[PDB]
Amino acid sequence: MIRLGYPCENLTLGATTNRTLRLAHLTEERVREKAAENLRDLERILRFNADHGFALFRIGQHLIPFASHPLFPYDWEGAYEEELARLGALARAFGQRLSMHPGQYVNPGSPDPEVVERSLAELRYSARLLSLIGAEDGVLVLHLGGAYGEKGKALRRFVENLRGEEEVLRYLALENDERLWNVEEVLKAAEALGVPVVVDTLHHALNPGRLPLEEALRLAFPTWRGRPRVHLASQDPKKRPGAHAFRVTREDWERLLSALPGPADVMVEAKGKEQGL
Numbered sequence: 001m002i003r004l005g006y007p008c009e010n011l012t013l014g015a016t017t018n019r020t021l022r023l024a025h026l027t028e029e030r031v032r033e034k035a036a037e038n039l040r041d042l043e044r045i046l047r048f049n050a051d052h053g054f055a056l057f058r059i060g061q062h063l064i065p066f067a068s069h070p071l072f073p074y075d076w077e078g079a080y081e082e083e084l085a086r087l088g089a090l091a092r093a094f095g096q097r098l099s100m101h102p103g104q105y106v107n108p109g110s111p112d113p114e115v116v117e118r119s120l121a122e123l124r125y126s127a128r129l130l131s132l133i134g135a136e137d138g139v140l141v142l143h144l145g146g147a148y149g150e151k152g153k154a155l156r157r158f159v160e161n162l163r164g165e166e167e168v169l170r171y172l173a174l175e176n177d178e179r180l181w182n183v184e185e186v187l188k189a190a191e192a193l194g195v196p197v198v199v200d201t202l203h204h205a206l207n208p209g210r211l212p213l214e215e216a217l218r219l220a221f222p223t224w225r226g227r228p229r230v231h232l233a234s235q236d237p238k239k240r241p242g243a244h245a246f247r248v249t250r251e252d253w254e255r256l257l258s259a260l261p262g263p264a265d266v267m268v269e270a271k272g273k274e275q276g277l
Contacts, residue, residue, distance in 0.1 A: 001263040003227070005049075005056020006273045007101065013048055015041035018060030028073045031065055038063045039080070042087055050094040054274065056265055058099045059129070061122070068118075068125035081132055088133035097227075097265060099139035100126045104177075107145035109158025116161055120168075127168040137226050140171035141198050144181040144189060151180070159192050173198050175231060176216075178242040182209035183216040187223075196223040198267075200231035201256055206241055214259045221261055228264045232256055236271075246271040 009016035017038045021030065042059065049057060064076045091098055106119045123140070130138040147154050162168065174190045175198040176183045183199055190197045197220040204216055211219070221228040234245035234252050248270050256266070270276025 001260075002257070003055040003097070003263075003265045004277065005054050005058070005097070005265070005267050006276070007058035007267065007269055008060045009273055010041075010045050010048060011273045011275050013041075013044055015044045015048075016060065017042050017045070018062045020062045020065055031073065032079075035064050035076070035080070038065075039083060039087070043090065046087065046090050046094060046096060049096060052274070055095065056097050056099070056267055058101055058267065061100065061102055061126070063129065064125075067129075068121040070121075077128065077132065084129070084132040085134060088135060091133065091135065097137050097139070098130065098133060098135040099141060099229075099267070100130065100171075101141045102126060104143055104145070106142070108161045109145050109154050111148055111154075111157070120161065120165065123162075123165065123168045127165075127171050130171050131167065135171075138171050139173050139198075139229060140168065141173050141175050141229075141231070143175050143177045144186060147180050155185075155189055159189055163193060169193065169195065173229065175200050176203050176207065178203045178206045180207075182207050183211055183220065184209050187219060190223060196220075196225070196229070198229050198231055200233070201252065202233040202235060202244070203231070203242070205235075213255060214261075217259055218261045221264070228262070229267065230256065230264050231267045231269060233269045244269055244271050245276075247276045 008018050019034045019038050021034060045057060066072055067076050102122055106122050107115055108119045110116045126140055130140065144158055173196045174186050176186045183204060186197055199216050199220050201213060204213055232248060234248045236243040236245045248268055268277045
């Protein structure tokens with residue numbers, strides 16, 4: 001009655017799907033080289049998860065580095081369709097669920113038309129990537145972004161820009177955050193878009209609203225067509241609010257498990273990755 005998983009990278013294997021590049025004037029072959037390393041590590045991690053009992057995994061945004069950028073030198077969709085299909089075959093064969101979580105700077109509900117143009121490009125890339133992997137229970141987790149003085153207007157601007165976006169909506173799920181948007185405010189936009197809700201337990205402890213963890217889950221689990229999804233973390237005792245601890249505490253598992261209205265998929269985000277549960 002619980003499925004586990006960790007994001008981006010594996011510490012034991014030293015494998016990561018999130019390599020990026022910095023040198024200026026990147027060549028085609030410098031980019032292909034890093035994409036290959038990320039894709040090789042994706043397979044390495046999927047096969048590891050099969051051996052070690054992990055159903056969930058989040059693919060790094062930098063799997064194909066700068067893929068959403070107009071300056072991406074080649075057709076990654078053509079160059080990697082065959083291998084991403086081969087990778088997703090393994091994933092389904094293992095019965096693994098794949099997801100992607102774009103950073104907090106991906107902001108479709110921005111008042112800035114230049115920032116929205118970037119965010120949508122990154123979202124179209126992620127959804128397309130999930131399509132090429134054949135992740136049909138695949139998830140595209142996203143925060144509602146900034147507030148910019150007016151919270152009510154920013155939320156409707158978020159819904160307007162994203163509802164044009166059929167392929168993105170096939171995977172999109174909305175998540176509550178530490179700062180601006182709680183579960184009930186996220187439920188608003190989720191029903192307004194016809195998408196599910198991911199409850200981040202740490203983000204809900206920091207930013208509850210008027211719902212206990214038990215009731216936020218009972219309100220979110222109905223929004224799922226398949227198996228409901230949760231984001232579990234622990235507050236780092238030394239760092240700022242929202243920062244994740246190396247390992248998830250026993251007590252934080254205790255409150256999640258004593259709150260579930262039914263079986264769920266748990267995305268565990270600790271600093272220790274697969275060593276952090």
